[PDB]
Amino acid sequence: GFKQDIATLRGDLRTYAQDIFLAFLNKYPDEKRNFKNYVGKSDQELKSMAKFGDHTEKVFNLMMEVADRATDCVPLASDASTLVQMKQHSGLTTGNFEKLFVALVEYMRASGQSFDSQSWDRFGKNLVSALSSAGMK
Ligand code: HEM
Ligand SMILES: *c1c(C)c(O)cc(C(C)C)c1O
Ligand SMILES: CC(C)C1=CC(=O)C(C)C=C1O
Numbered sequence: 001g002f003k004q005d006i007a008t009l010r011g012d013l014r015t016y017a018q019d020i021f022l023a024f025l026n027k028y029p030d031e032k033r034n035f036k037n038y039v040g041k042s043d044q045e046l047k048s049m050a051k052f053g054d055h056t057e058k059v060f061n062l063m064m065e066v067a068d069r070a071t072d073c074v075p076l077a078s079d080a081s082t083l084v085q086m087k088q089h090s091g092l093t094t095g096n097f098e099k100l101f102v103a104l105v106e107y108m109r110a111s112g113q114s115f116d117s118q119s120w121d122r123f124g125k126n127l128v129s130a131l132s133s134a135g136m137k
């Protein structure tokens with residue numbers, strides 16, 4: 001279920017973070033508008049870039065904490081507030097987050113693995129709801 005999937009992802013977090021973030025960037029090419037340093041690079045070149053890995057990992061380190069602190073895939077309002085009020089998220093809207101979670105769920109469905117993809121889908125919807133509530137447009 002959801003709590004085991006957090007354990008699974010954390011067990012190889014750099015790998016999973018980069019693979020899911022590349023699945024998001026490739027599924028939604030316009031989303032490389034929030035990322036000028038990634039333009040004109042292949043996946044292998046992005047994995048070579050220290051920024052790419054350090055940053056993607058820090059995104060998933062936080063996402064897994066927000067997942068871990070959730071009850072029944074419902075994130076804490078305090079974690080939504082943190083995500084809306086981060087200076088790095090100033091230009092963002094809930095659609096940015098929705099797309100990341102669609103990619104994440106798709107990746108999980110496509111994997112050979114017993115991820116609880118329905119729970120991730122619901123968590124992403126609940127996060128987007130909480131971000132909206134917290135004041136994201
Ligand atoms: C649950 C989902 C997400 C979490 C937990 C999260 C968390 C974070 C964290 C921790 C950072 C700082 C990393 C660093 O400076 O090394 C960051 C930066 C960033 N995040 Fe988010 N984020 C999420 C979703 C997104 C989405 C959906 C977008 C855009 C589609 C986005 C765009 C950014 C940008 C543009 C930066 C800074 C630019 C850069 O230097 O790469 N994030 N995020
Ligand atoms: C997430 C979890 C962890 C849970 O127990 C239930 C749901 C759905 C089935 C309401 C989640 O998305
Ligand atoms: C990043 C942005 C300029 C952009 C938008 C897109 O629609 C596509 C296919 C490709 C892109 O590069």
Ligand SMILES: CC(C)C1=CC(=O)C(C)C=C1O
Pocket residue numbers: 021051052054055056057058059088
């Ligand atoms: C997801 C990944 C590439 C990522 C890395 C980052 O370092 C920042 C600042 C923001 C991100 O979204």
Ligand SMILES: CC(C)C1=CC(=O)[C@H](C)C=C1O
Pocket residue numbers: 001002116118119
């Ligand atoms: C406890 C039970 C009803 C339940 C919990 C879940 O987490 C999932 C994905 C599916 C379920 O039906």
